[PDB]
Amino acid sequence: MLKETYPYYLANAAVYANTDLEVTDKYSGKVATRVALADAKAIDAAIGAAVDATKPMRELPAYKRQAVLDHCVARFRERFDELAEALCIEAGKPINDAKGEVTRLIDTFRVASEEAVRIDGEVLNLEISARAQGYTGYTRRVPIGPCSFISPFNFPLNLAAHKVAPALAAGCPFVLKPASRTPVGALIIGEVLAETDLPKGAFSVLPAHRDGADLFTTDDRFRLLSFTGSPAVGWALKEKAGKKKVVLELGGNAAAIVDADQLDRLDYVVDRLAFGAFYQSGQSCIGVQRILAHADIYDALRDKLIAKTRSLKMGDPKDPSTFVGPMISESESRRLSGWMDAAVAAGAKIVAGGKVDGAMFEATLLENVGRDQDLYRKEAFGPIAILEKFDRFDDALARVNDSDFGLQAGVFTDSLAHTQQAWDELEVGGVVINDVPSFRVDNMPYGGVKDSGLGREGIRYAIEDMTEPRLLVVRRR
Amino acid sequence: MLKETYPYYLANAAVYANTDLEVTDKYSGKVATRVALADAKAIDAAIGAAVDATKPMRELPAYKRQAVLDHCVARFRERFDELAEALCIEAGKPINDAKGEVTRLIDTFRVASEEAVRIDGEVLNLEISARAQGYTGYTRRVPIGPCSFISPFNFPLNLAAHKVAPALAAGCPFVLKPASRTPVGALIIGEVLAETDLPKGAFSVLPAHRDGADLFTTDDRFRLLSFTGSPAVGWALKEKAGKKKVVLELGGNAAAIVDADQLDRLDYVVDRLAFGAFYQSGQSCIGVQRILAHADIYDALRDKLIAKTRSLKMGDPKDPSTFVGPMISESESRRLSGWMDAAVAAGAKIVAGGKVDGAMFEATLLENVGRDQDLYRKEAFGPIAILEKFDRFDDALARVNDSDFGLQAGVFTDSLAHTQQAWDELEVGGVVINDVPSFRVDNMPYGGVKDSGLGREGIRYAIEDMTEPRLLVVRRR
Amino acid sequence: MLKETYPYYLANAAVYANTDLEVTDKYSGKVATRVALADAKAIDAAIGAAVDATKPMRELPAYKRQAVLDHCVARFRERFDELAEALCIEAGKPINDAKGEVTRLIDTFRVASEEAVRIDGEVLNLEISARAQGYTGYTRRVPIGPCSFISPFNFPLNLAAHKVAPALAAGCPFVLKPASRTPVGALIIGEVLAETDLPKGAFSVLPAHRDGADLFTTDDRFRLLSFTGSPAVGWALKEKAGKKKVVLELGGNAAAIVDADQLDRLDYVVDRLAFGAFYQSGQSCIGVQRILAHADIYDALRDKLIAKTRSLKMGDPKDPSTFVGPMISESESRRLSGWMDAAVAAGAKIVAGGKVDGAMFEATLLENVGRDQDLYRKEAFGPIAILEKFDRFDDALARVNDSDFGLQAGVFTDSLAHTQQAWDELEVGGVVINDVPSFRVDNMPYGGVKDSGLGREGIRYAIEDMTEPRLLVVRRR
Amino acid sequence: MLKETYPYYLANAAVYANTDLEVTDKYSGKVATRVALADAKAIDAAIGAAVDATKPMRELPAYKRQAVLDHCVARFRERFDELAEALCIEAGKPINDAKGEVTRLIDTFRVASEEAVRIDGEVLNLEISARAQGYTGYTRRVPIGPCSFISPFNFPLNLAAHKVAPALAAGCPFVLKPASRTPVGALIIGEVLAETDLPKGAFSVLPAHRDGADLFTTDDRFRLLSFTGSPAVGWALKEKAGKKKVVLELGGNAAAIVDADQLDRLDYVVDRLAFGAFYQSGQSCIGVQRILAHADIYDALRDKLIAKTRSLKMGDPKDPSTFVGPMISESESRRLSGWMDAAVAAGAKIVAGGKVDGAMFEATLLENVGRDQDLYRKEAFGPIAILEKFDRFDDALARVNDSDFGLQAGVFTDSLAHTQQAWDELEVGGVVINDVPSFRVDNMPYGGVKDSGLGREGIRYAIEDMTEPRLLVVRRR
């Protein structure tokens, strides 16, 4: 059970300012807790404190930044079940998927702990011509300054971690705005950070609705905005950011290709397709939305995938036997069911699932979806997948690329040539081979091209964005 | 002598579309040549051709990109004197400084030739926890796509090279808009590239005035805008760029510190201060504008710097004995002379030089300039320097940092502690030790923080910005 | 108190084979414990088991190797005081220096834990010319195979750790022979490793006297010999090693230079000189043996160093107020006192200390030692230091280099030029600036040139030596 | 035609000391030239001069080392046909293969030119724990010192280049002993180097027979021996080398696997198998000796390979239509024909070729060769290949590994799983996919494990071996 109320964190300190943000249990619909909602005055105060903490943060030695991160790792391990249960409530996340997220939260912070003590530089040969005889270069990474972080509803812990943990490793103060539907995970991160010896102003965690969050984008005291969320929002915020650096982690309509040589592997393939399409009710930025299957294996794959989809239990996410929990809201279920209805009216067929009861949307598989349909081209963000057929690998690649988006794609194949062609031709951040696009391991470079992002996360890459190189050129004569 | 007319380059081809852009000899004021001016229809056509060339460019093997760059190097060596003389005319650049720029143009292209065949990736351990057993990552750099390049008047060849050469190494088509006051250097680069086997649309070089250049910032078919020019313009273009990545190389009011231990080195220090403050008439983004001298050596430095400044010959830049050529225009000379007059009226003193005859602005040294004056705080971009005194090194560092800007700074010292403190505390892209901030070698990371830039040039760093990483995750079971 | 007896570790298992190796308390001289001594049959069996464990070790995933190392870290933290007290007894090491070594043991294993999950490779551009169009390279590091490790008496824990920890990170089975005078630390490492899930044959820890240890050098089933010990032994073993790779970590007569600018820093300098010369009774491979002091500060340094040397308490290493413990044996004290006597007979002067009572050799400072004396040129390995004067920095560098050896040197200076010159000219593995040569941090590359070594330790560098690169060249057509 | 006589190069200077080494045309058998043979007095003088050149070489700036290498590249391009014709004569190398070697000589020197200006170091975080607060590390690569180089007969130019070019890039003086059967290529390299501004003693090129070459291994003034040649010699020299570092590039009995999925690719596979087995008469350290073909494609591959082998013209290597030139001597042809006869007597069958006329050994293919035969297990080094069959991929890998050797192997496959398994399991330096093991590109890491080598060549890797790291540790307080 969640605590009755939660504070926000203003310049490292818990402030029980109000109880104005109600957070519901996404399965029962009951109010599960109330948290303090930050207004513009509080946001402004947090930003000023972050400016004031910039020098103290920059002066922390590497091993001290590591020690802060290690304290977080230890506390997250100690509170593992509490954290997983909180995710289950506030995100409606099936308990096995919630435990999966807490395991990843720990991985992300542990990678950051390791990277905090290996932010190395280079000794550069500058003697490339006679004019530069006797010069040598030395590099270091300096913290960029105060960072503005905005995170989405669907991984309340780990996607905040992908900003918070590298900021601490890099030596940047930050102000984090979690999603209002799922703020508790970030507030527990804040609680744990408040136990450490960080300078005042090193961090704030401030719940705020989007309509009250302008300063997170526009305030000129932030030197970086790093936003994870919908493409419609992220590209709009880039336009308003001003001088600061912008990093965007957005969405897409990810595809998985199943090649002709997969007959003897179909039970594995189907298990992974069902995971990617339907885990956490399809609410993943790399959830499987489109499945392109080679004609040689299409019928066998279809039959097994219909049976697998029908087998997935929907219900209370606290029950470990539940695979499909509630979607995040009835309004989001209605968005997706409208797209599904429109695809069917235009000729598509529901071949497994299809029933929708409020936010309880069954795992659903469709055939014959037109490539012009919203269900095909927009980001479904729910427990639906589209199955389509191809006859030659080039056509599968073209159809994956027939999208505004480009986050990840997956290919199940034993062909070396097809693996190489996919790497060459798929206009995505990441191509996964012999697993779904929905796979991520927390050290890997991660992000999108096209409308799906601008930049990469994963600890090393976030540290790079959160620092500025400073060159020392030394002339000897 | 320049050719009578020059074409522009539209999708690799010379087009003598008109003679509407007059280019003056900046010393005599006479029209030296006329070049074709691109309109919006031509700019749009160039962008479409760049889209069409994206796939052919991406498919060029590394050694073929290298061969294009090597052809450029060979031709620039063959045409060395022609190129230097063209710079002398169109930029009013003293012939020794013009030869210096051509030497650097060759360095920049040679570094790019070397880097074109070493765009390596990583094999990443992904087995950081049990969930990721059997996964491995492989990385590559993919060209970002069509690039929009805008360059300034003062290094007509080398600052274009810092965009063009890495684009070719990385496999990106590009459209370059040179400065209208100095377009010839870029058009000679275009002429040389037109001799190579590049696919149609690989490059365009299009003169256009700023008021006709909106598409270089706003067109959504470009995936990167890389702008080198004034801070007032660059920050405004970032706001209008839309989704594309933005790189900015801007300006500043660079300082050099002369430490207490420099008495026996003062003739060297003074020679370098005069170079940094007055070469190419102070028209460098890292020209020395402010000189902070320790009280122990202030008087001796002052005396030598007055004598050195008075010794610098001003006149015809074609004469190898000329040190100070014309400024780029009478209007720019009038801007700077107005700031100088205002500083004097407020209490400053001209201690060497000070005479202004049209665009012929003498090398000038001032004392007693208030830190609130435009001459102190804005970008002088002319042959003036301000001398000021300090008593302890911390105060010198604070005064360097007392600026909107942060491009480079220099420190003449033999103190290891002061060298370390400068690297820690100077909020600049680069700190130069025992030379002026005006030093750059073309492989080094180069750029500004604060209002002076966003990102780095130097070949390796430009290639990074002109590419997207693409991860291949391979699962073995 | 040590346990009454210790086993050896044969293919991961404790074997109480005999009690034939007596280990004395180096202060009291009493037998403190008895340990099992391995004969040739046991050594041969260990090597065969290491061969048999090669494939299982190579197949362990990275995170499992990390988990083994993490178990060691946790157990060493839990047993910190026990480990420090054991060092105090078996090595006669002052308790503060013993705690220092255990702290370093933990650092070494923690660095190895981090490095175990970042043994990355490269994706290499191979398209350097037309013949190689369509080829790409991919690299990995494969364990070299069974490793033979030999460690010395003076850091019974940490110098074994610098071989054991990287071997585990790299996936190599190993057989370790500790020093017979100080085997207990290695046997506690073995005890802790025996608690982990490693495959049988992953490790053996076998006490054996040098005269029974031929197989550690000659057996052809080992693919690497890594030896830490005296130069006279190491160079002789290289000759007998056969086909295997050889890494040598040897000794020297390390020097510290004190520059002319150090007057206001002399109390710091003297504190560090006394640490480097006299900690663990001078029994460090990078102990300060020679002190070169600039004429400007010589007298002031001399006076302070005489007073500091006289202040160092000699006695029972279990007492935290003891600075100078016993030397490792009376025979080693007699070796050094003979060299000291010979230097005095030839004209040197003892200016502080000089009294020798069995293995209790006082911290001692000499002046006027001829550069031809054994005390100058050979490895003292005891609590003596020689002070000499210089007038110009070039002469100090020449005198540091006037040696068979080249491990580390130190320079106390604030001159940037002198720092640069020292890095250029000192023929050593490592140059330390503003600390003694006796400083090491366990991640840094570490080793000697000239007669002082061949190769580097420090975790990353040891992993490199304990692996073979394996290139995959893939041709696409 | 070769020149009538050639000098040797002693400390950069041509010395026509004698004409005692006759070099034959390996096709006609006539003496083609006579070269000066170095005695022990000359070898000793060269070594002393290399010691004397160590400091001047170390002080050369990077761009000057690059300029020396660039001069070599330009001269080799200018003299391309001369160099190829000399190889044709002294090595009996078919002119197309000789031109191939000269092309590679240029690649090797060009890679070295590029690498000479990018010998970078690292700025290392040393703040891993509180003891190391305020310390930072900086690295550089220092030349190791004088190098001893020994090269073999079969690539008279390029295998010398793989030692000479990195030595120059790294700043090491060297003494090169080419093969007495083929010294001319190395003497032309020496002639070209003698045109450059290198300090006296930077290089010597000294022909000497093995029985007069002891000092190349034993002299203690060399700090590295790098040997390319037979395994029987290389392992013996390691035993005699003393203190110096040893690098070995040796031989093997390389295998190519043809997988079940290759039917539609067999003409390509057969073309590459014939190249690898029979180019330069099989005289390659990575020549194809063993061909393992999957049962599904065995008969079709066999038929095509018999026809291809029979089609290869044997004769005068000056004729561009000749594929198979003479072997290096009649004695080497007799060695191999004896092994072939013994394999046939034990049950093997010659299925194509088999005729031997002096040094003219036809391209030959055998079936049914016992795995215990010398022809199978020893290094053939001539134009013979053995064909054998397998039914499952694991067995093919085991049979490749059933050898004393481990240089390179090749696998023709479209299976991703088999590619991965080959990389995991083949105990070789390099695994080539979709080409023969006989492929090398001159920048790639290259060398053997097991009895085939110790260390890697390829420019970057040779530079690493020819340098020592020197760490600078700087403490700030």
Ligand SMILES: NC(=O)C1=CN([C@@H]2O[C@H](COP(=O)(O)OP(=O)(O)OC[C@H]3O[C@@H](n4cnc5c(N)ncnc54)[C@H](OP(=O)(O)O)[C@@H]3O)[C@@H](O)[C@H]2O)C=CC1
């Ligand atoms: N690339 C990646 O790593 C991932 C990206 N995503 C993407 O996130 C989306 C789903 O998450 P969801 O939370 O619904 O996304 P939203 O874009 O609706 O919201 C994301 C965050 O942005 C905030 N926000 C919205 N508008 C503004 C604004 N004008 N100013 C400031 N903050 C604002 C929200 O605040 P509030 O809601 O409190 O009003 C929330 O904190 C999908 O598109 C998905 O692909 C998800 C996970 C992975």
Ligand SMILES: NC(=O)C1=CN([C@@H]2O[C@H](COP(=O)(O)OP(=O)(O)OC[C@H]3O[C@@H](n4cnc5c(N)ncnc54)[C@H](OP(=O)(O)O)[C@@H]3O)[C@@H](O)[C@H]2O)C=CC1
């Ligand atoms: N890994 C690699 O890069 C390559 C290795 N090789 C290997 O080289 C061999 C073929 O070449 P080959 O020339 O016949 O090899 P050898 O081993 O017969 O001779 C190689 C070189 O070593 C010299 N040499 C031989 N014995 C001594 C000695 N005691 N002291 C000093 N020098 C000595 C030879 O001198 P001289 O002949 O003048 O008496 C020659 O210069 C094969 O085993 C092949 O695999 C070949 C090419 C590639």
